Amino acid sequence: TRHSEIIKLENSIRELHDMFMDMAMLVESQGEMIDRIEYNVEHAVDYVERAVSDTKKAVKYQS
Amino acid sequence: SKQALSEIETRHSEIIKLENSIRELHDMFMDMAMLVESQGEMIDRIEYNVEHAVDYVERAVSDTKKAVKYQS
Amino acid sequence: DAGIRTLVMLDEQGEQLERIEEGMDQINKDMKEAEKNLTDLGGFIRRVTNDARENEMDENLEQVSGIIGNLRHMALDMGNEIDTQNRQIDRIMEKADSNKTRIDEANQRATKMLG
Amino acid sequence: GMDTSGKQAEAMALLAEAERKVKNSKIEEACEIYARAANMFKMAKNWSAAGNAFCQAAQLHLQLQSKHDAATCFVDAGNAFKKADPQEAINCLMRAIEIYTDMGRFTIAAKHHISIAEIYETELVDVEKAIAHYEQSADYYKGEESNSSANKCLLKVAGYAAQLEQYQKAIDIYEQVGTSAMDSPLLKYSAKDYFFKAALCHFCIDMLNAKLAVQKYEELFPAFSDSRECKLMKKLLEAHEEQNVDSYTESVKEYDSISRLDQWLTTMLLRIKKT
Amino acid sequence: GMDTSGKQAEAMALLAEAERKVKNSIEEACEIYARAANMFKMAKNWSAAGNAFCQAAQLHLQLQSKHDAATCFVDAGNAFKKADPQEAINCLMRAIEIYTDMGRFTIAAKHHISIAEIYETELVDVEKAIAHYEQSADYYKGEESNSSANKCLLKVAGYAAQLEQYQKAIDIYEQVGTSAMDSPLLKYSAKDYFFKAALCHFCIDMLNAKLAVQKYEELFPAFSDSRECKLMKKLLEAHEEQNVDSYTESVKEYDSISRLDQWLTTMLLRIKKTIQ
Amino acid sequence: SADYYKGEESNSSANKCLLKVAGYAAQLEQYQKAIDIYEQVGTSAMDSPLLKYSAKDYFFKAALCHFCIDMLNAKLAVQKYEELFPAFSDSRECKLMKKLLEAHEEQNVDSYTESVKEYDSISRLDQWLTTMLLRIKKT
């Protein structure tokens, strides 16, 4: 009975390690993607803010 | 006999192995916690940024509606 | 306790992801409408001695094993949650990029028609 | 199926109407109506014809003054062709990658490179083309400091090369990724498995120098000593010294008791043990 | 292959056209410069692409444009990162100055972190890296960014203890541990920081380390039950009687129970060397 | 804030505010409102997949929040909670509450103190939990 319990516990620990490995790699990829989107959205909002300001000043100068 | 003492020693060696295994598990959990915390705070900052962006977009849309309605 | 805290906080992250997805969709729709309007503008231990030195010990280790199974449950739930979050972010990516493309093309068109 | 026939008839009719309208400024409307017809055909679920219509619409858009829209149409047509002749999808995705690189977006170009590599390897037995695409994607990612994707591509190419009997490239990549994991406080727990795979690759060459390689791995990574991988590898080598199947077979069976060996590791184990 | 020669020829033609257009005297010239720099990047010639990026940034800035100028400067710095670390660092400084002028704290702090990383990994300098980390910590703490500020403070303390005096490291570890004691997520790690400070006290003198461990134990009752407390008590006892054998016995026992981080070993080696 | 979030239909956000309000009310010695909030939150989180593991916790607090009112009503509430959520029996919370109630039945403060100290040793207690146990020790 010792062999059965010991091997079951070791298999469970191995499963813990494998699933946590996969989860950690996925979290790293998600963090990289989230950084990319942060920079993307910041630049996009800045560019649209510049474009709308340019349009406002242009229309005011014209009228 | 001395066999009993040796059996106790092997028992305790296995216990030490389990000690190391559980220590490794706890270390892995601690490692994971910090990454989760960083991801969450970063999500919070991104949400703040997008909320400000949408507020500005709505203000600009309202201004454009005002301008187009009054000019025509 | 570590796992419980991680799980609750990941739930919070998922809610925030949903909120940002809704915001991005609204932004894209508003920009498209504005562009169209502008275009239209123009046991555990073997028994050698028994006793509490082996009974209490294996009871404690069985409790520890039960807690390890509880950690099993926590890990599975965490993995599923993170798996959902990954696809959510991946979906948001394309919409954000397409919105940037739309605004860039609109700016180019505006700078061309004026002359 | 009545629903599929009705959808196909509606999509054919819409495409015919679009052709009539374009045959009759007009470029914008023709492009929009052709895109609508292509979308409807994709809903109709006929892969070849829908993909051809989407490609024609993308070409018509190219005739129009637009760059990113043409690339989006190209990638959509390639995805549609994914269920069609692989050559057309490969060409369209290559054109989209070229357009994106012209615009300067390395990330989407590398994503398209990975997608084309995956479809090439899964649909066609040609592995070298997928390896070349993986190498290009890894270069693109390394250019943009995307260490995760670069490491994934390196691992994939190293595994394929090991399967191809190019043990030098695979073992060098394994050592590189292992030392990178060592440097990074995170992901350093996979360095033991990476070094185990590298040791297997080295053993494939011979056995005498495997002792030096394992010594180098142990001194570089002391924690590998307590990891079961080191014990199993050294025990397997010692059993291999004896010309007996029983020793190393028992060792590997006991190891398999804990978990099921993967196909690649099992194949290498059979290759080493047989000779 | 055709790629390098073709892209170089295209970039040179674009540069000549832009130079002629500016000589005619302007946004078209800036776009042409950006496209030529993109071709240079595709040509794999990382060097001399940053020069074109900087020229385009200056041309855009000449007409009061700032956002595009800052982004172009950051891109030029990133491109020069491998081609020329010094030019990349200078461009990053210019971008940080622009962002500070506009008030973007997070971007400035991130650029400071990038400068610290490049300077410490490529060139040989710790004081510059320490200053950059300190600036990043200040910027993040100003914007209630607790995690990044704590990480920067921990790295600065680590570098100081590695080379600089033990006072700064002790103070930083004390502050971080005191802040983290109340945090439920980070409580399990709090003791860690304190322990390092205690070791940093031993170099000053044995009495200093004894007083520091006493203060930490009284402040944190849980730290008393920590195995680190037992190890430190045994080490202090060994240093009291100048017994190297007991010191090494405790060190080997701690290593066998738990692996070392390569920093505790160095401090223990220093203490053993000065034990006399 | 909780009412605003409820009107916004953003669940899981007002629950924390209500829990904090209930805890403050318990610190104010008004246990009716805290008990009501805790039971409502436990019922809401019982069927939640993720929060299920935490739902039982709330019940335990309610039990302690229900202990100051009197012993018999607290016992009845504990039985009701245990029958409502069977898995709450496995939790050490039920054992601790039953042991403390048994000690308080015979007015042997020593057994209650020993149980509290052992529970704290196994898991460090909370300031609110320690204060509540001290107040319970009065009777």
Judge contact between F44 and F53, C-beta under 8 A: no
Judge contact between F97 and F60, C-beta under 8 A: yes
Q: Quote the CA–CA distance of B20 and E258 in Å, as a whole number.
A: 8
Subunit contact C8:F50, Cβ cutoff 8 A: yes
Chain A to chain C, count of Cβ pairs less than 8 Å apart?
52
CA proximity to D72, closest of A36, C106, C94, C111: C94
Report the Cα–Cα distance between both ends of chain D, in Å, rounded.
58
Burial class of residue E266 (count of CB atoms within 10 Å of its CB; 0-12, 13-18, 19+): middle
Residues of B in contact with E147 (CB under 8 A): 37-38, 41
Joined tokens for residue F61: 């607090």
Task: Please tell me the distance in Å from F70's CA to the nearest CA on chain C.
Answer: 32
Judge contact between F42 and F55, C-beta under 8 A: yes
Q: Quote the CA–CA distance of D107 and D111 in Å, as a whole number.
A: 6
Residue found by looking up tokens 């002629």 in the block:
E20
Q: Quote the CA–CA distance of E44 and F26 in Å, as a whole number.
A: 68
Please tell me the experimental approach by which this structure was elucidated.
cryo-EM
Q: Which amino acid is at D51?
A: G
Residues of D in contact with B28 (CB under 8 A): 189
CA distances from F122 to E230, F118, F125 (A): 20, 6, 9
DSSP character at residue E25:
-
Resolution expressed in Å:
3.5
Helix (H, G, I), strand (E, B) or coil at E202: helix
* Interchain CB contact of E147 with C (< 8 Å): no
Q: Quote the CA–CA distance of E4 and D269 in Å, as a whole number.
A: 44
Q: Quote the CA–CA distance of D4 and D247 in Å, as a whole number.
A: 62
Q: Quote the CA–CA distance of D210 and D192 in Å, as a whole number.
A: 16
Residues of D in contact with B31 (CB under 8 A): 186
Q: Quote the CA–CA distance of E275 and C94 in Å, as a whole number.
A: 63
Burial class of residue D262 (count of CB atoms within 10 Å of its CB; 0-12, 13-18, 19+): exposed
* Interchain CB contact of C1 with E (< 8 Å): yes
Query: Quick one: how far is CA E93 from the chain centroid?
Result: 15
Instruction: Say whether the C–D interface has 3 or more Cβ pairs within 8 Å.
Output: yes
Burial class of residue B14 (count of CB atoms within 10 Å of its CB; 0-12, 13-18, 19+): middle
Joined tokens for residue E181: 């004691």
What residues contact A1, with CB distance under 8 A and at least 6 apart? C43
Judge contact between E132 and E115, C-beta under 8 A: yes
Name the closest residue on chain B to residue C72, using Cα atoms: B25
Judge contact between D27 and D63, C-beta under 8 A: yes
Q: How many CB atoms lie within 10 A of CB B38?
A: 16
Q: Quote the CA–CA distance of C53 and E21 in Å, as a whole number.
A: 91
Q: Quote the CA–CA distance of C16 and C14 in Å, as a whole number.
A: 5
Query: Quick one: how far is CA B58 from the chain centroid?
Result: 32
Q: Quote the CA–CA distance of E118 and E111 in Å, as a whole number.
A: 10
What residues contact E147, with CB distance under 8 A and at least 6 apart? B37, B38, B41
Which subunits have 3 or more CB–CB pairs within 8 Å of chain E? A, B, C, D
Q: Quote the CA–CA distance of D58 and D238 in Å, as a whole number.
A: 63
CA distances from D175 to C10, D220, E236, F44 (A): 35, 11, 42, 52
CA proximity to D69, closest of D61, D57, D79, D77: D61
Q: How many CB atoms lie within 10 A of CB B44?
A: 13
Subunit contact B46:A30, Cβ cutoff 8 A: no
Q: Quote the CA–CA distance of B28 and B33 in Å, as a whole number.
A: 9
Q: Quote the CA–CA distance of E63 and D174 in Å, as a whole number.
A: 52
Judge contact between E241 and E233, C-beta under 8 A: no
Q: Quote the CA–CA distance of F133 and C36 in Å, as a whole number.
A: 67
Query: In sequence order, which ranges of D64-190 are alpha helices (DSSP H)?
Result: 68-81, 86-103, 106-123, 127-143, 147-163, 167-183
Subunit contact B43:A34, Cβ cutoff 8 A: yes
Instruction: Say whether the D–A interface has 3 or more Cβ pairs within 8 Å.
Output: yes
Best mutation site among C63, C85, C114 for testing chain A: the one with the most A CBs within 10 Å?
A: C85
Task: Please tell me the distance in Å from B9's CA to the nearest CA on chain D.
Answer: 19
Residues of B in contact with A17 (CB under 8 A): 28
CA angle E82, E88, E91 (to 5 degrees): 160
Judge contact between D36 and D53, C-beta under 8 A: no
Judge contact between C113 and C43, C-beta under 8 A: no
Query: Quick one: how far is CA D173 from the chain centroid?
Result: 16
* Interchain CB contact of F89 with C (< 8 Å): no
Q: Quote the CA–CA distance of E199 and E272 in Å, as a whole number.
A: 12
- Report the half-sphere exposure of E269 (CA within 13 A, side-chain side): 6
Subunit contact F53:C11, Cβ cutoff 8 A: no
Joined tokens for residue D79: 């995805």
Q: Quote the CA–CA distance of C32 and C106 in Å, as a whole number.
A: 10
Rg value, chain F, Cα: 16
Rounded-to-10 torsion of CA D174, D175, D176, D181 = 90
